Amino acid sequence: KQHNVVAGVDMGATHIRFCLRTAEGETLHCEKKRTAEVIAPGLVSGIGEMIDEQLRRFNARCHGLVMGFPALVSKDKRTIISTPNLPLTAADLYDLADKLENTLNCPVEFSRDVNLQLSWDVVENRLTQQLVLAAYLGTGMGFAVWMNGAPWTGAHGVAGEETNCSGMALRRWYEQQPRNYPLRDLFVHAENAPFVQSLLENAARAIATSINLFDPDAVILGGGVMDMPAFPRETLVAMTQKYLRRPLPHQVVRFIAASSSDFNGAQGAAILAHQRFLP
Amino acid sequence: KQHNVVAGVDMGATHIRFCLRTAEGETLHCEKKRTAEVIAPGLVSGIGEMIDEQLRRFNARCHGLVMGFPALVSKDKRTIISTPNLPLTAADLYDLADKLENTLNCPVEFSRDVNLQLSWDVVENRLTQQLVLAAYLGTGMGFAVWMNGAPWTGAHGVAGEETNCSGMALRRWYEQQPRNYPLRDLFVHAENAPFVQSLLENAARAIATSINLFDPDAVILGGGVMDMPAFPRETLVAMTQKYLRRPLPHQVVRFIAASSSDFNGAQGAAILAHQRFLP
């Protein structure tokens, strides 16, 4: 049984997620591999063989690849323009889009990881025709924009770019002295720490600033910091609402909690590949 | 000699500027009237007769009106959604777009005043095909966006919306105690006042925040505060550049000084009317 597919790959420091989506919009396959294993034969050979084994298995023809990176990506989506925190060399990233195209025999585009999460969340929340802003609080504060039916990256591809309002800032505060609880449980025991409340207020000001400037239909809040036990999502939303201009955008902007699931990112990439390289 | 024209009107507290632009892109007429005089017969009758006298004079047919207000304007450009600081009643603004259309026999759109200045500056700087951000420092901090060949207003028309970083903040500081110099000469004598330097740093942070989020090709800096004698434009640009993410957008965003001339706003409105209602 033949299949026409697109490939979605989300590239992490420890794992790589990979999804195959049919022309019909069906998820044909999803897998998670360890990054170290995939790149052992060289990055291009590794990805090429990871994808091609599944194409051969499902008798699939691949019409394109969207690959996610925790890094800045050029306007034309072909060049990684910041050093990603991945176990890859400078040489590996060099001319990667062309090398992947030659090996995979289909177009290849790159995307910043937060656009993949944004795409999953926009499609899942029925927001594809709206102006949507996403704030992803992880190791740093990640912001993304959905506009005109696609992720929006500005003039040079770097739209949506805080030292002390991030996962790194929380880690550095935690590390100041010995704690009776693990870092992952910080919000269970330290939600009311003066420094933690200042971080939440800051994040709130930043989110509210972005909302006042874009005037979106909706705002998706998420990131790895929001997945931590006892993270006060309701307090952050209420803090942000204090700074929204009234009557509009205060009375009309809708707040959505981001989906946090293993394959969302890879699936997001597959959805973007489908839009760009099909129907 | 027949003429096909569009009307551009910029509405101020003291004066109203009015421009007629031909289908051929020629400025046929410009005039400045006192707002009080124009509205003496009622606002609709006043504007209708101000425009119609010139149409009769030039034997002109009007294909549309873009009218500027120091106020928020709805997404569909037909409703003024904040109270403007003009000598008009609530009743005068009510259903104004329809009343003007019936009287003038052409389509009528409204625009926030800063979009008119933005349009003049974008066309004059050959930036119509770029992503352009404008920061207009007047009584308040006004921001505007040019994207996809036109002013961009967000989902609800209020994109681009600081208590102590504005013309009002400078006025209130000036008024704290008697001064040996007039308010208009504040930057000649008080550029280095600790409060004035804090205002400039704040404006810089705000401008830099907007640039980091939109990642524009260019930024137009202006407003009535920048027209004041000795305003340190170079210091503000240098302060803003400290906060721009490097290499991009720091090494590629271009800074432009806004044009400050009597009819720029009315002309901006005429340019928008031409785009919307001609060729």
Report the distance separating Cα B105 and Cα A47, nearest Å.
Answer: 64
DSSP SS3 for A196: helix
Question: Among the residues of B175-263, which ranges form H helices?
Answer: 186-190, 194-214, 233-242
The helix or strand, by DSSP H or E, that contains position A37, with its residue range, turns out to be helix A35-39
Using CA coordinates, name the residue in chain A closest to B142. Answer: A213
Token readout for A53 is 């084994």
Report the distance separating Cα A90 and Cα A111, nearest Å.
Answer: 18
Strand partners, B111: B68
Q: How many CB atoms lie within 10 A of CB A1?
A: 5
Q: Pick from A81, A130, A156: which is nearest to B155 by CB?
A: A130
The widest CA-to-CA distance across chain B, in whole angstroms, is 61
Establish if B212 touches chain A: CB-CB under 8 angstroms: yes
Question: Among the residues of B215-254, which ranges form H helices?
Answer: 233-242
Report the distance separating Cα B119 and Cα B264, nearest Å.
Answer: 9
Report the distance separating Cα B36 and Cα B87, nearest Å.
Answer: 8
Establish if A147 touches chain B: CB-CB under 8 angstroms: no
The helix or strand, by DSSP H or E, that contains position B56, with its residue range, turns out to be helix B43-58
Distance from the A161 Cα atom to the nearest Cα atom in chain B, whole angstroms: 5
Establish if A130 touches chain B: CB-CB under 8 angstroms: yes
Phi and psi at B207, nearest 5°, equal -65, -45
Token readout for B72 is 């928020």
Rounded to whole angstroms, what are the CA distances from A20 to A13, A65, A265?
21, 9, 13
**Which among B202, B205, B197 is positioned nearest to B243, based on CA atoms?**
B205
Strand partners, A86: none
Q: How many CB atoms lie within 10 A of CB A264?
A: 21
Q: Which residues contact B215 (CB under 8 A, 6 or more apart)?
A: A153, A154, A155, A156, A157, A158, A159, A160, A161, B131, B248, B249
DSSP state of B80: B
Rounded to whole angstroms, what are the CA distances from A93 to A104, A198, A246, B153, B193?
16, 38, 47, 38, 50
Report the distance separating Cα B126 and Cα B183, nearest Å.
Answer: 35
Distance from the A154 Cα atom to the nearest Cα atom in chain B, whole angstroms: 5
Task: Please name the amino acid found at residue A118.
Answer: L
DSSP SS3 for A209: helix
**Which among A102, A149, A141 is positioned nearest to A224, based on CA atoms?**
A141
Residues annotated in a binding site of B for ATP: 8-15, 140-147
Q: Are strands A108-112 and B3-11 parallel, antiparallel or unpaired?
A: unpaired
Cβ contact (<8 Å) for B155 and A245?
no
Report the distance separating Cα B187 and Cα B193, nearest Å.
Answer: 9
Cβ contact (<8 Å) for B214 and A154?
yes
Strand partners, B158: none
Q: Pick from A81, A143, A215: which is nearest to B159 by CB?
A: A215
| C-alpha A84 chain-centroid distance | 13
Establish if A153 touches chain B: CB-CB under 8 angstroms: yes
Report the distance separating Cα A126 and Cα A123, nearest Å.
Answer: 5
Report the distance separating Cα B208 and Cα B239, nearest Å.
Answer: 9
Q: Which residues contact B86 (CB under 8 A, 6 or more apart)?
A: B11, B12, B13, B35, B69, B70
CA triple B175-B181-B185, angle to 5 deg: 90
Characterise A96 by phi-psi region: left (phi > 0), alpha (psi -120 to 50), beta (else). Answer: alpha
With contacts defined as CB-CB under 8 Å, which chain B residues touch A245? Answer: 158, 161
Cβ contact (<8 Å) for B156 and A212?
no
Rounded to whole angstroms, what are the CA distances from B132 to A77, A114, B235?
21, 24, 21
Q: Which residues contact B64 (CB under 8 A, 6 or more apart)?
A: B6, B7, B106, B107, B108, B109, B273, B276, B277, B278
Report the distance separating Cα A261 and Cα A28, nearest Å.
Answer: 18
Cβ contact (<8 Å) for B252 and A156?
yes
Token readout for B271 is 């340019």
Q: How many CB atoms lie within 10 A of CB A220?
A: 26
Rounded to whole angstroms, what are the CA distances from A138 to A12, A145, A162, A227, B99?
14, 17, 11, 9, 52
Give the neighbor-by-neighbor strand order of the sheet with B150-152: B150-152, B141-147, B132-137, B218-222, B254-257
Report the distance separating Cα B117 and Cα B103, nearest Å.
Answer: 27
Establish if A216 touches chain B: CB-CB under 8 angstroms: yes
The helix or strand, by DSSP H or E, that contains position A53, with its residue range, turns out to be helix A43-58
Establish if A131 touches chain B: CB-CB under 8 angstroms: yes
Domains in chain A: ranges and CATH: 1-111 (3.30.420.40), 112-279 (3.30.420.40)
Q: Which residues contact A137 (CB under 8 A, 6 or more apart)?
A: A166, A167, A203, A221, A222, A223, A224, A225, A226
Task: Please name the amino acid found at residue B74.
Answer: S
Sign of CA dihedral B78, B84, B90, B92: negative
Task: Please name the amino acid found at residue B261.
Answer: S
Question: Among the residues of B215-263, which ranges form H helices?
Answer: 233-242
Phi and psi at B150, nearest 5°, equal -165, 165
Q: Pick from A160, A212, A215: which is nearest to B155 by CB?
A: A215
Q: Which residues contact A91 (CB under 8 A, 6 or more apart)?
A: none
Establish if B156 touches chain A: CB-CB under 8 angstroms: yes
Report the distance separating Cα A13 and Cα A19, nearest Å.
Answer: 18
Token readout for B6 is 């569009």
DSSP state of A173: H
A-B contacts at Cβ under 8 angstroms? 76
Report the distance separating Cα A227 and Cα A138, nearest Å.
Answer: 9
DSSP SS3 for A136: strand
Q: What's the Rg (C-alpha) of chain B? A: 20
Q: What's the Rg (C-alpha) of chain A? A: 20
Report the distance separating Cα A126 and Cα A147, nearest Å.
Answer: 14
Q: How many CB atoms lie within 10 A of CB B255?
A: 16
Q: How many CB atoms lie within 10 A of CB A78?
A: 17
Q: Which residues contact A250 (CB under 8 A, 6 or more apart)?
A: A241, A244
Report the distance separating Cα B51 and Cα B57, nearest Å.
Answer: 10
Report the distance separating Cα A206 and Cα A218, nearest Å.
Answer: 16
CA triple A254-A259-A263, angle to 5 deg: 150
**Which among B274, B260, B8, B267 is positioned nearest to B137, based on CA atoms?**
B260
DSSP A115-134: HHHHHHHHHHTT-TTS-EEE
**Which among B115, B241, B225 is positioned nearest to B174, based on CA atoms?**
B225
